[PDB]
Design a protein around this ligand. Structure first.
Ligand SMILES: Nc1nc2c(ncn2[C@@H]2O[C@H](COP(=O)(O)OP(=O)(O)OP(=O)(O)O)[C@@H](O)[C@H]2O)c(=O)[nH]1
Ligand SMILES: Nc1nc2c(ncn2[C@@H]2O[C@H](COP(=O)(O)OP(=O)(O)O)[C@@H](O)[C@H]2O)c(=O)[nH]1
Ligand SMILES: COc1ccc(N(C)c2cc(=O)oc3ccccc23)cc1O
Ligand SMILES: [Ca+2]
Ligand SMILES: [Mg+2]
Ligand SMILES: [Mg+2]
Lengths: 440, 428
């Protein structure tokens, strides 16, 4: 205890999952065969890293993870790749037909055929836990499976696990690496369906990550592999508190208390520093003040929006590596007399801080420089609602003409599901406006 | 009235609790294994107040260790005096309380409370004549706060004629874990007002400021805060623990310190103020002790004594000094400030002396004040409560455990009543 089970859904979820688990193995000294020499308790234990890895009697450390896709070719690459011995074959689940970029097929036509088997495999993992804390769910907003299957699974998980916590890492669509013209539809449909079932969701805007790879790492035309390496660093920062222990370590659940003021207001903005090439990190040491400052540079955010034009409801800083509170406090005091940091009037202004001492790790042949110290800020800002406004507008353009709607109707959906989903989104944008208004 | 039963709940409760036992065991000649290795008879004469005698011949703290999570208590067990505690008195769950008073008080705590009361009962049954209970906890988290106050209510039901005493750590934004602290503290204060006889308000704001302004520690840790707490705790219990010219117990403290049953929240103070490590060689004079012990900067509750009046004060001087000079200085400070002491309680300042000084000091003074200025502490928490509560912010963490907003409204009103009840005696 307290175990977390990761569920990777569809292509984006699965490929991000690859990058995350590879990095976790590197951070914990776990080899591709699952062996971890530094782990002296064989076949079990309650160390920090056991939240994410179970142990076999043969000394193999196995991800508490299920990979699901409605099509086999992405997961086949996990089955035949570098980390193939890490996973029991029953953790890697595939159908034959995808959702064809269609939410209705992911949630209903094709999804319903595999959902009982998925819950069976998840149940098998949950039965091996002594104090299951909850689920981490990785998926795209845009894919037929990442949208439709994820929303089906989240609904079913609420039924079978009650109020057990469910967190998301959700890939928000960008034009530069998108795959379907109907991504706005799928995004709104899943967001509406999943909203009551999720406790906290970390959106990752592909365009923000694409820009960062271009500008900070001098990658001309970033691929999924470039994006995922960066995303995995951000995910690793967030989960580090669960996977390591230390005196100044602060549990993710404790950040969550501060980050979620109302159940629907559950979308933290993540910002990460430093992202720097080997070439530029050479002979240039980035201090605590420097990386903390970089957290308030909108160019470093995982979602494109402008917090300088919204209000904060919470600010959390999650440090890793060579960082002491004295330096943090100094960096914060400087920032607080120099930046556009306005809080709503009903929330206190103190930043919440955690420090894990294990330095950032980098994957071999990657683009990121190995650094001594990094930080992920999690803020709850009203600015995140910009991302909703942009997506809702794209949805409105197509929906007014009912463009592509017949593909969904043809699979059993009704127009009333689109309008209901969209209204929930209008009410969400409205909610973010209301929390930003001064008290009477 | 001999035996005190000690309870420590939650992270803060167990951390300040472990430190209290380290300090008082050292003062009483007791080592980590439970063996007496001291050279004064004063060390043993009243040791039964806090320690059980196993045939050993070992001394075992009458202490129950309680948490909803194992972490902090494992840390106590492997800590300096960890082995001294009766292993059967470690009562812990697995799930934690998530800084949530509702989890501690209604859901998770409810599940564990009966087994704590079983341990309480076994200790109480082995008492010649039980005085009552002391609880250490914070008010800002979930376990010490929600479950601690649940325990108090259940202890009162089963032992309604025993004294309940708490050391209650008040939250501060200056040293803060979560935004919900003011919620947890207000819910808890409501409980304390009804079900304790006496409560030491240990204010994290004051502890922080002392460490920063006075001890010149630019970045205070919990460890630095707890150094102040354990010195204060040793001081305030001196007259329960050592034979003297005034022989006190929890009931006599309450009778003499509490003129109205709700006004039982004490502002403690200590002098000389020191840190761990770098300590002064310069000895203190009795006029310097007396001046310092009454200074706002030496108070463990962040209130200005000049913004109110003392109803009652107990002062304890430790070390070899002139009792004549003590009496003179105590009388001097009263006669020169008598507008700050209510004139309708004659002789409301009482002094006691003990020859045994604390570790690392030649002399010290401990202050226990029942001042109407404590209203400032409660007003501060009230403002923080209302800032969130007016927008119902963060309330879903509590309604999810089955609480209703009515219960928040009621606890707020009761704490505001307490405040205006203090204001009432500050004028007359
Ligand atoms: N960051 C990132 N985004 C991805 C990745 N793979 C796909 N995407 C994005 O995900 C969206 C498309 O969804 P996918 O996850 O590929 O689709 P799926 O979940 O497999 O669903 P179908 O193939 O329709 O059944 C687009 O916005 C893509 O840019 C990846 O490895 N990383
Ligand atoms: N003075 C002091 N305060 C503490 C300590 N540990 C936690 N706190 C404070 O206690 C409150 C949180 O409660 P905590 O005891 O951690 O939670 P619990 O385990 O659920 O009771 C906050 O107001 C913290 O500032 C400590 O060791 N010393
Ligand atoms: C207007 O937006 C889109 C149009 C098509 C497609 N897909 C799925 C293609 C299918 C294919 O067989 O050939 C392609 C060649 C070039 C580009 C796309 C396709 C995706 C889109 O977003
Ligand atoms: Ca092990
Ligand atoms: Mg696919
Ligand atoms: Mg705590």
């Amino acid at each position: 205890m307290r175990e977390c089970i990761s569920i990777h859904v569809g292509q984006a979820g699965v490929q991000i999952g690859n990058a995350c688990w590879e990095l976790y193995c590197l951070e914990h000294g776990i080899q591709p065969d699952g062996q971890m020499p530094s782990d002296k308790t064989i076949g079990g234990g309650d160390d920090s890293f056991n939240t994410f890895f179970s142990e076999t009697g043969a000394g193999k450390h196995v991800p508490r993870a299920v990979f699901v896709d409605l099509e086999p070719t992405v997961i086949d690459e996990v089955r035949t790749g570098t980390y193939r011995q890490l996973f029991h074959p029953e953790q890697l689940i595939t159908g034959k037909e995808d959702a064809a970029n269609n939410y209705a097929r992911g949630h209903y036509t094709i999804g319903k055929e595999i959902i009982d088997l998925v819950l069976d495999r998840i149940r098998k993992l949950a039965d091996q836990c002594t104090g299951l804390q909850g689920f981490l769910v990785f998926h795209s907003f845009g894919g037929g499976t990442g949208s439709g299957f994820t929303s089906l699974l989240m609904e079913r998980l609420s039924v079978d696990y009650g109020k057990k916590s469910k967190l998301e890492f959700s890939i928000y669509p960008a034009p530069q690496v998108s795959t379907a013209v109907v991504e706005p539809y799928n995004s709104i449909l899943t967001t509406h369906t999943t909203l009551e079932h999720s406790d906290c969701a970390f959106m990752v805007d592909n365009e923000a990550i694409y820009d960062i790879c271009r500008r900070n790492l001098d990658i001309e035309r970033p691929t999924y592999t470039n994006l995922n390496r960066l995303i995995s660093q951000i995910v690793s920062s967030i989960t580090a508190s669960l996977r390591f222990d230390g005196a100044l370590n602060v549990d993710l659940t404790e950040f969550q208390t501060n980050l979620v003021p109302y159940p629907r207001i559950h979308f933290p903005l993540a910002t990460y520093a430093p992202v720097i090439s080997a070439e530029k990190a050479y002979h240039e040491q980035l201090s605590v003040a420097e990386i903390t400052n970089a957290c308030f540079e909108p160019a470093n955010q995982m979602v494109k929006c402008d917090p300088r034009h919204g209000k904060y409801m919470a600010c959390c800083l999650l440090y890793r590596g060579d960082v002491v509170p004295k330096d943090v406090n100094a960096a914060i005091a400087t920032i607080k007399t120099k930046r556009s940091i306005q809080f709503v009037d009903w929330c206190p202004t103190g930043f919440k801080v955690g420090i894990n001492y294990q330095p950032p790790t980098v994957v071999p042949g990657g683009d990121l420089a190995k650094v001594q110290r990094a930080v992920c800020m999690l803020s709850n800002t009203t600015a995140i609602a910009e991302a909703w406004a942009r997506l809702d507008h794209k949805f409105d353009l197509m929906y007014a003409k009912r463009a592509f709607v017949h593909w969904y109707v043809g699979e059993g959906m009704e127009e009333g599901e689109f309008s209901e989903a969209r209204e929930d989104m209008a009410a969400l944008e409205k909610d973010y406006e209301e929390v930003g208004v001064d008290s009477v | 009235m001999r035996e005190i039963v000690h309870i420590q709940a939650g992270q803060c409760g167990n951390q300040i609790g472990a430190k209290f036992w380290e300090v008082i065991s050292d003062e009483h000649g007791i080592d980590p294994t439970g063996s007496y290795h001291g050279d004064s008879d004063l060390q043993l004469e009243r040791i039964n107040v806090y320690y059980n005698e196993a045939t050993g011949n070992k001394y075992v703290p009458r202490a129950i260790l309680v948490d909803l999570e194992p972490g902090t208590m494992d840390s106590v067990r492997s800590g300096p005096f960890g082995q001294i505690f009766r292993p059967d008195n470690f009562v812990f769950g697995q799930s934690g309380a998530g800084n949530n008073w509702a989890k501690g008080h209604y859901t998770e705590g409810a599940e564990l409370v009966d087994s704590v009361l079983d341990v309480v009962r076994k200790e109480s049954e082995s008492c010649d004549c039980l005085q009552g209970f002391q609880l250490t906890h914070s008010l800002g988290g979930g376990t010490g706060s929600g479950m601690g106050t649940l325990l108090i209510s259940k202890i009162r039901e089963e032992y309604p004629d025993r004294i309940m005493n708490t050391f209650s750590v008040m939250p501060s934004p200056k040293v803060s874990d979560t935004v919900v602290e003011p919620y947890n503290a207000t819910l808890s204060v409501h409980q304390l007002v009804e079900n304790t006889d006496e409560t030491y308000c240990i204010d994290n704001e004051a502890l922080y400021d002392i460490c920063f302004r006075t001890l010149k520690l630019t970045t205070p840790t919990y460890g630095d805060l707890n150094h102040l707490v354990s010195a204060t705790m040793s001081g305030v219990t001196t007259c329960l623990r050592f034979p003297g010219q005034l022989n006190a117990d929890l009931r006599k403290l309450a009778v003499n310190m509490v003129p109205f049953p709700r006004l039982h929240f004490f502002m403690p103070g200590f002098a000389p103020l020191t840190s761990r490590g770098s300590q002064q060689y310069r000895a203190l004079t009795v006029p310097e002790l007396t001046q310092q012990m009454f200074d706002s900067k030496n108070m463990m509750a962040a209130c200005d004594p000049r913004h109110g009046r003392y109803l009652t004060v107990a002062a304890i001087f430790r070390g070899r000094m002139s009792m004549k000079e003590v009496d003179e200085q105590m009388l001097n400070v009263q006669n020169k400030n008598s507008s700050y002491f209510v004139e309708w309680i004659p002789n409301n300042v009482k002094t006691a002396v003990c020859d045994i000084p604390p570790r690392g000091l030649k002399m010290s003074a401990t202050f226990i004040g029942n001042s109407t200025a404590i209203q400032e502490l409660f007003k501060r928490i009230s403002e923080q409560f209302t800032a969130m509560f007016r927008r119902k912010a963060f309330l879903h963490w509590y309604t999810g455990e089955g609480m209703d907003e009515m219960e928040f409204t009621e606890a707020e009103s009761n704490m505001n009543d307490l405040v205006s009840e203090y204001q009432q005696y500050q004028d007359a």
